[PDB]
């Protein structure tokens, strides 16, 4: 099999009767990764993300049998406080890279000023301390430091943008690569779209809405706004989630608030939702134990 991480690529000889937990543990041991609960192995079926089941046969999955057979090692779940919950430099680094990619690809909205500060920590992490003798005008010119949306919002040239980033970069002197990547994560985790799984749903009337699923609970959004939910259901505020046919129903732990019901058509998606729900709830509770 071919295992693709954010920064690296592995090749593995897999035994035909091995299970997800075997291949996962193999990748985890190879990386030196002891906090395994955040991660998973991803392939996508028909435009939909899917994850490798631990207790099921590897080749039983819908993954393309055509060689090489390819899975992406990625964080499935996100901590509530990155600095507090990510102990190993390896786990931190994995999150840093994946999150930074989400932000650059505009999977996670970041506003312009924050995006410049984020870019500056990424530069600190890669190049170490700012050195005007080492780093002169044009030194970032081939890097992609900013979302295109931020760049397009202004008339600024690459050197104008380099100047804004370098101005911030200069002030980070003294922070080690891991500390810089963690400062990046502290900012990114406060972004509103950070760590949220979005799914198109519809309510009883048939109004198209968005279901978010994250570490803190469940959220309903107007399709146009992914930043602020119209409704939130914190994990410790919900009695049960129910699924049958194409429908979900959310029953609040307080009987005096209406249950929320919605329709989700695609079946593969619905499993993902339940998976994500169970996973996120589990992690929510264990932080509070």
């Amino acid at each position: 099999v071919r295992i693709v991480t954010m920064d690296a690529e592995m090749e593995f000889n897999c035994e035909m009767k091995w299970k997800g937990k075997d291949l996962f543990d193999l990748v985890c041991r190879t990386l030196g990764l002891r906090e395994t609960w955040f991660f998973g192995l991803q392939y996508t079926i028909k435009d939909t993300v899917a994850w490798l089941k631990m207790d099921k046969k590897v080749l039983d999955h819908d993954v393309s049998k055509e060689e090489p057979v390819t899975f992406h090692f990625l964080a499935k779940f996100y901590p509530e406080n990155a600095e507090e919950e990510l102990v190993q430099e390896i786990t931190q680094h994995l999150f840093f890279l994946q999150v930074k990619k989400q932000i650059l690809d505009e999977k996670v909205y970041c506003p312009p000023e924050a995006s410049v500060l984020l870019a500056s920590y990424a530069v600190q992490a890669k190049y170490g301390d700012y050195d005007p003798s080492v780093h002169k005008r044009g030194f970032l010119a081939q890097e992609e430091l900013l979302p295109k949306r931020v760049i397009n919002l202004y008339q600024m040239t690459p050197e104008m943008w380099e100047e804004r980033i370098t101005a911030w970069y200069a002030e980070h002197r003294g922070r080690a690569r891991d500390e810089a990547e963690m400062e990046y994560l502290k900012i990114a985790q406060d972004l509103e779209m950070y760590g949220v799984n979005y799914f198109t749903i519809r309510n009883k009337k048939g109004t198209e809405l968005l279901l978010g699923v994250d570490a803190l609970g469940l959220h309903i959004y107007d399709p146009e706004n992914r930043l602020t939910p119209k409704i939130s259901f914190p994990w410790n505020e919900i009695r049960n989630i129910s699924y049958s046919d194409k429908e979900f129903t959310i029953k609040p732990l307080d009987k005096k608030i209406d249950v929320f019901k919605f329709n989700s058509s695609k079946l593969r998606v619905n499993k993902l939702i339940l998976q994500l729900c169970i996973g996120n709830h589990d992690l929510f509770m264990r932080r509070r134990k």
Partner: peptide, 11 residues
């Protein structure tokens, strides 16, 4: 499409 329920918490 199997029926699923998640019971969260104890109450």
């Amino acid at each position: 499409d199997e029926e699923v329920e998640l019971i969260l918490g104890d109450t």
